[PDB]
Design a protein around this ligand. Structure first.
Ligand SMILES: CCCCCCCCCCCCCCCCCC(=O)OC[C@H](COP(=O)([O-])OCC(O)COP(=O)([O-])OC[C@@H](COC(=O)CCCCCCCCCCCCCCCCC)OC(=O)CCCCCCCCCCCCCCCCC)OC(=O)CCCCCCCCCCCCCCCCC
Ligand SMILES: CCCCCCCCCCCCCCCCCC(=O)OC[C@H](COP(=O)([O-])OCC(O)COP(=O)([O-])OC[C@@H](COC(=O)CCCCCCCCCCCCCCCCC)OC(=O)CCCCCCCCCCCCCCCCC)OC(=O)CCCCCCCCCCCCCCCCC
Ligand SMILES: CCCCCCCCCCCCCCCCCC(=O)OC[C@H](COP(=O)([O-])OCC(O)COP(=O)([O-])OC[C@@H](COC(=O)CCCCCCCCCCCCCCCCC)OC(=O)CCCCCCCCCCCCCCCCC)OC(=O)CCCCCCCCCCCCCCCCC
Ligand SMILES: CCCCCCCCCCCCCCCCCC(=O)OC[C@H](COP(=O)([O-])OCC[N+](C)(C)C)OC(=O)CCCCCCCCCCCCCCCCC
Ligand SMILES: COC1=C(OC)C(=O)C(C/C=C(\C)CC/C=C(\C)CC/C=C(\C)CC/C=C(\C)CC/C=C(\C)CC/C=C(\C)CC/C=C(/C)CCC=C(C)C)=C(C)C1=O
Ligand SMILES: CCCCCCCC/C=C\CCCCCCCC(=O)OC[C@H](COP(=O)(O)OCCN)OC(=O)CCCCCCC/C=C\CCCCCCCC
Lengths: 149, 61, 65, 145, 209, 47, 150, 99
């Protein structure tokens, strides 16, 4: 979506419309398929009835048509999982540590440069604590790649 | 005096397709007639203020 | 702000002192779903302005127009 | 039209070098094909412009209907609608009262005001007043917000 | 070569004779000037903008033919022509409707073409010299009725003051120096006459009416 | 003369919905995207 | 309730608007105009039914061109709606709206009839900010014709 | 002093939401009648004013326009010249300006 950055005030405008288009036209696919079946559409789903009671079969046909739509609609929970996993990775990267101790000739003198800053974490920071933050970073992205794929 | 006049909020349209919650929710909203009460400042839309409950997602910079 | 009567030392919005800074929106989908820039074209004149035309319709009928 | 030739060099023979003289002709040939399209489109474009001329008279009557209405008192032009609920509307009104009662600290620069030391030397000894600690700021009617 | 270039050649025919015939074949500075400004058909005279349109027009038109040439959604409803099962028939008119909407791509470009711009905030910034304004500038306004009605009212009342002003000056001219100084005077003032001097009574110093 | 012609109004669109001014932006973007995609598919049968 | 009424004041034909009547009676007037399409559409059905029963079962109209037979059903259809609309008003409804408009101001010409929802008003600070038609641009007054009596 | 510093005289409540900062509610905010209920209320006031409140209106409008003048001596001149010679205190009682 990079090529649409200046086309509107929202970079993800086309993506936010496309997910709605994707939802509506996928939802209409089973509906148009039942229309193509005709009035016999319930026999295409469940098959032959079992009881002489039309009211009894009416309940079983109401379930087969519901199951027919749940097979499609319940798959959008996979899209929810992919979005949540992608947001948690963006939250970890956006909040990742970056201070003046990593800058070359910093001029941000008021951002903790001239203050006493001790911590209560494990010492040997770049050997113990900093690699641990990177280990969890690798887990976040490897877990994301496995989920979204 | 200038700062005080500047805080009196301006009127910002409610219609919004840039925020994906409004893009979906406003398709089910019902536009009701806003009967004129005799004033020129009826806040029938949201207000152009960063602290307004319907404008907090807007970046006022 | 300068024309309004506030002299400005320095420049930019990366406030060195005791002020809140507002960095640019991170160009990543997370922040681009939560925020969007203020569209100036959405700040409008209140529609109650159109009710002043009620005076015109009444003046026309009073003058036999 | 004829082009004046300085004759600084002899041009190649047209029979020996024919490709050097062809580009000018095929360029005007392209334009002639475009003019055939412009002329053939006279009735289609004219029919649309003719429809706009007839549509102009219906739009005139619809605008006066939209603005003046049935009996010249105002039409749908005076209608305004909203999606705000009743709570959203009274939140905005209170938000307007809050911004009316939102002041900044310290006021204005006291050094740009009339000094008391200057008034004494001008012949008017000012009287010192106490702070009005009993008044409560309130918002005006909604028509003034 | 185009007709506009041929129209230039008819007008520049005398100029073409001065430069190409006379100046071009001379030597020295006059020769270098004539050979440099020689008149004829253009070298590298192609117009890339015209060529850019022809390319994009042909490329976009081939896209229109694909998007508009669709099988009908209506004809596939009866299951009797060419289409029995079409699970995405409800997408058939999305591309044609999208292409037809592209006709207003340039008609509605930017904010001003989609609304009445004087009712929007950006119009105010343009009239202020492309200057930033507070976001509520559209609300803090004096009545346009007052500005125009008061402008007419003041000038109409000035014509009626001019008539009263003439009657006051004339009536004061026939007043004694004692009267014109004691009338409308402070009660504590004791009148004492001044020496009589000759001062003209001019209504308008400039010879106006 | 009929009130159906009122749909041609854009001066006072903020009085009713103010949605038209934002939806056509997507439609123009959507046409640009399909133009780049479809022209690539149909043209690239030539190699 | 935006309806212009044409009332019979003896020999004069006076006009008024439903916004000039109290809301308690505007609902009764709107309820009557809402039953006109129910009588109009219902009468169109009877005119369509009785006509179809006559152009088919009566073997004197059935032996005719279809264009003549369709014209009878078409004519009897809308004619059955116009008749039912007259029976609706003439029975007791054209006189009921006249009684419901008792006390409302009327005008000699329709062009002089104002719509109360379209009038300009302001919030009068001198009267507890109540809405007032006597704004600071008013000169003379309204001066309607008379109060309707039925 | 912080550039984004305001002093508010009425209570406000802030939202406890991540990435956002706004006023989500006002304490003890009561909702009055709707825009439609207020409209019906005003129509009843405007209807009675149209039917029963138009006689003798030209005289009261002249008294109101005279009392919008800057100086009192001009008000007395307006009342005497335009309002048929009305009294200052008598017209002030009609308009409701007298205590
Ligand atoms: C809040 C929104 C809510 C709704 C949302 C969803 C919207 C739904 C819309 C979907 C699409 C609807 C459009 C339908 C198109 C119909 C077009 C048509 O008419 O074609 C005919 C067509 C049938 O023709 P055919 O199949 O092609 O072939 C017929 C055979 O040739 C014929 O063979 P045969 O001759 O052997 O058959 C015998 C006969 C036998 O039939 C009988 O069973 C007879 C019944 C008994 C009659 C009473 C007899 C009384 C006897 C009394 C005796 C008295 C005499 C006694 C003795 C007197 C002695 C004097 O059967 C028939 O032929 C009749 C079939 C026609 C019935 C039409 C059914 C559709 C009605 C739909 C109603 C609502 C429409 C609203 C649409 C508005 C737009 C949305 O009808 C259909 O195809 C129906 C398809 C429907 C499938 C779509 C279902 C979609 C799912 C909806 C539910 C989703 C649930 C889950 C939701 C989850 C969340 C999303
Ligand atoms: C007749 C006898 C004559 C001799 C008599 C005496 C004999 C010797 C007795 C010694 C007496 C005690 C010595 C005291 C002097 C200490 C001086 C000093 O510099 O200490 C600084 C050092 C750091 O402490 P600090 O700087 O003062 O900070 C205070 C707090 O710790 C701060 O608290 P914190 O929580 O903030 O700190 C976090 C914590 C981090 O958390 C930890 O504590 C890390 C623990 C994870 C490692 C644990 C596993 C280690 C063993 C793996 C190998 C196992 C092999 C067998 C596997 C069997 C499996 C069943 O500490 C660190 O950050 C540690 C980073 C510094 C070291 C990391 C890199 C070390 C180099 C590794 C490569 C060495 C290559 C070998 C080359 C040989 C020549 C050099 O202190 C120690 O680490 C104590 C270590 C004690 C020895 C450990 C055993 C080593 C065994 C190595 C096995 C391979 C060789 C076998 C040779 C066999 C020979 C027989
Ligand atoms: C007074 C003047 C003189 C009068 C006399 C002279 C005039 C006489 C006639 C002259 C010619 C007239 C042309 C038409 C008759 C031609 C006869 C024929 O056989 O043609 C077959 C002809 C042959 O096919 P083809 O040549 O191969 O291709 C045809 C087209 O290229 C494309 O074909 P296509 O099949 O691919 O097009 C499909 C498209 C065709 O485009 C349309 O027709 C637009 C349809 C949009 C409306 C859909 C309504 C859905 C149901 C709503 C139910 C309630 C309605 C309430 C309405 C209230 C309105 C506020 O429809 C769709 O896209 C269907 C999918 C829609 C998306 C999904 C929407 C439904 C799901 C969402 C439901 C939401 C609610 C759920 C819950 C509900 C609550 C329970 O196909 C046609 O249908 C031709 C029509 C093309 C347009 C012609 C326009 C000409 C310009 C005239 C002005 C416009 C008039 C029409 C305006 C309609 C209102 C928008
Ligand atoms: C006021 C609104 C309600 C009006 C009445 C109800 C009408 C139905 C609601 C309007 C729907 C309009 C939008 C959808 C248009 C149809 C879309 C569609 O898919 O149609 C394709 C269908 C194609 O059907 P098909 O059977 O030929 O092929 C489809 C085969 N399958 C299903 C397998 C794909 O054609 C239709 O038009 C069917 C709908 C007909 C509805 C007609 C209702 C009245 C019936 C005639 C009157 C009978 C009176 C008694 C007669 C006495 C003897 C003479
Ligand atoms: C209809 O179907 C469609 C196509 O066909 C298939 C498409 O190609 C396309 C694609 C569209 C394109 C490829 C075109 C793209 C064009 C774009 C983006 C903008 C083009 C802009 C320009 C060429 C700049 C032109 C610059 C100007 C007009 C300003 C300078 C010119 C001036 C001041 C002239 C003054 C104008 C007049 C007097 C108007 C009169 C008109 C004339 C022709 C007179 C000319 C007079 C003389 C003396 C030459 C679409 C969208 C489509 O829908
Ligand atoms: C292979 C083994 C397992 C994986 C571990 C490998 C990673 C090892 C990390 C090497 C660190 C070695 C030198 C680091 C020193 C520079 C950083 C530093 O000085 O710390 C700055 C600071 C902590 O300092 P304070 O908490 O303020 O303590 C001050 C005490 N007075 O830490 C940081 O800011 C983090 C460093 C900057 C992060 C930059 C992110 C880079 C992105 C890497 C991803 C690569 C993308 C690939 C495409």
């Amino acid at each position: 979506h990079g090529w649409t950055s200046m086309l509107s005030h929202a970079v993800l405008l086309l993506s936010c419309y496309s997910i709605i288009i994707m939802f509506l036209f996928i939802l209409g696919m089973p509906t148009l398929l039942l229309y193509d079946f005709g009035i016999f559409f319930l026999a295409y789903l469940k098959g032959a009835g079992k009881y002489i009671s039309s009211v009894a079969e009416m309940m079983f046909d109401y379930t087969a048509c519901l199951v027919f739509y749940i097979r499609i609609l319940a798959q959008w929970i996979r899209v929810v999982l992919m979005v949540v996993t992608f947001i948690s990775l963006s939250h970890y990267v956006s909040d990742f540590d970056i201070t003046n101790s990593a800058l070359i000739g910093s001029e941000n003198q008021s951002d903790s440069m001239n203050e006493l800053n001790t911590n209560f974490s494990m010492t040997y920071y770049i050997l113990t604590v900093l690699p641990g933050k990177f280990i969890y970073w690798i887990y976040e992205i490897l877990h994301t790649f496995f989920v979204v794929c | 005096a200038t700062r005080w006049y500047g805080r009196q909020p301006g009127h910002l349209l409610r219609a919004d397709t840039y925020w994906i919650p409004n893009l979906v929710s406003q398709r089910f909203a019902k536009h009701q007639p806003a009967h004129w009460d005799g004033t020129q400042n009826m806040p029938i839309f949201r207000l152009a203020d960063p602290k307004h409950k319907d404008s907090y997602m807007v970046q006022f910079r | 702000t300068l024309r309004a009567g506030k002299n400005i030392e320095g420049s930019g919005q990366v406030h060195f002192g005791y002020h809140d800074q507002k960095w640019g929106m991170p160009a990543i989908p997370m922040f681009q779903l939560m925020y969007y820039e203020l569209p100036g074209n959405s700040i409008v004149v209140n529609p109650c302005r159109n009710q002043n035309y009620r005076l015109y319709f009444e003046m026309r009928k009073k003058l036999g127009i | 039209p004829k082009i004046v030739n300085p004759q600084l060099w002899p041009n190649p023979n047209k029979l020996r070098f024919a490709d050097l003289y062809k580009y000018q002709g095929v360029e005007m040939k392209k334009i002639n094909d475009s003019i055939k399209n412009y002329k053939a489109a006279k009735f289609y474009i004219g029919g649309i412009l003719g429809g706009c001329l007839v549509f102009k008279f219906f739009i005139d009557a619809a605008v006066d209907k939209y603005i003046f209405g049935e009996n010249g008192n105002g039409g749908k032009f005076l209608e305004m609608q909203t999606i705000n609920s009743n709570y959203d509307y009274y939140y905005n009104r209170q938000f307007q009262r809050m911004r009316y009662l939102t002041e900044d600290p310290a006021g204005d620069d006291p050094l740009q005001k009339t000094k008391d030391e200057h008034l004494v030397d001008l012949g008017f000894i000012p009287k010192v007043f106490g702070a009005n600690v009993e008044v409560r700021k309130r918002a005006p009617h909604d028509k003034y917000l | 070569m185009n007709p506009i270039q041929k129209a230039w050649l008819k007008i520049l025919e005398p100029v073409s004779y001065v430069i190409n015939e006379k100046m071009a074949k001379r030597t020295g500075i006059i020769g270098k000037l004539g050979r440099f400004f020689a008149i004829g058909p253009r070298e590298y005279g192609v117009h890339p903008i015209n060529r850019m349109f022809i390319f994009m027009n042909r490329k976009y038109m081939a896209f229109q033919a694909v998007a508009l040439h669709r099988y009908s959604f209506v004809k596939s409803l009866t299951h009797n022509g060419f289409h029995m099962l079409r699970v995405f028939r409800h997408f058939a008119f999305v591309l044609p409707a999208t292409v037809l909407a592209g006709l207003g791509l340039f008609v509605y470009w930017g904010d001003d073409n989609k609304c009445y711009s004087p009712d929007r905030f950006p119009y105010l910034k343009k009239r202020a010299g492309d200057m930033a304004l507070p976001l509520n500038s559209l609300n803090q306004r004096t009545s346009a009725h007052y500005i125009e009605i008061n402008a007419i009212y003041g000038a109409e009342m000035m014509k009626r003051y001019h008539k009263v002003w003439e009657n006051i000056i004339e009536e004061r001219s026939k007043a004694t120096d004692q009267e014109k100084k004691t009338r409308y005077a402070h009660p504590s003032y004791q009148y004492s006459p001044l020496p009589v001097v000759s001062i003209p009574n001019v209504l308008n110093p400039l010879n106006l009416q | 003369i009929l009130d159906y012609l009122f749909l041609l109004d854009l001066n006072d669109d903020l009085t009713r919905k103010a949605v038209f001014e934002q939806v056509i932006i997507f439609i123009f973007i959507y046409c640009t995207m399909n133009f780049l995609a479809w022209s690539t598919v149909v043209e690239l049968i030539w190699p | 309730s935006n309806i212009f009424l044409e009332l019979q004041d003896g020999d004069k034909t006076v006009y008024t608007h439903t916004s000039l009547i109290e809301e308690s009676k505007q609902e009764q007037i709107q309820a009557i105009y809402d039953k006109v399409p129910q009588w109009t559409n219902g009468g169109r059905f009877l005119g369509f039914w009785l006509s179809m029963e006559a152009v088919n079962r009566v073997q004197s109209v059935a032996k005719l061109p279809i264009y003549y037979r369709a014209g009878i059903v078409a004519t009897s259809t809308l004619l059955g709606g116009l008749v039912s609309s007259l029976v609706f008003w003439k029975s007791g409804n054209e006189n009921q709206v006249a009684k419901l408009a008792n006390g409302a101001p009327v005008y000699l010409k329709k062009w002089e009839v104002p719509e109360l929802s379209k009038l300009y008003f302001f919030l009068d600070d001198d009267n507890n900010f109540k809405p007032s038609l006597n704004h600071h641009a008013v000169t003379q007054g309204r001066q309607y014709y008379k109060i309707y009596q039925h | 002093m912080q550039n984004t510093t305001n002093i508010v005289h009425v209570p406000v409540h802030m939202g406890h939401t991540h990435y956002f900062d706004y006023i989500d509610s006002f304490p003890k905010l009561k909702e009055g009648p709707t825009l439609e209920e207020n409209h019906i209320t005003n129509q009843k006031i405007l209807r009675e004013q149209l039917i029963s409140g138009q006689q003798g209106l030209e005289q009261n409008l002249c008294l109101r326009n005279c009392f919008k003048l800057s100086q009192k001596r001009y008000i007395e001149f307006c009342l005497d010249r335009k309002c048929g010679g009305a009294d200052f205190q008598r017209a002030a009682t009609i308009l409701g300006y007298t205590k």
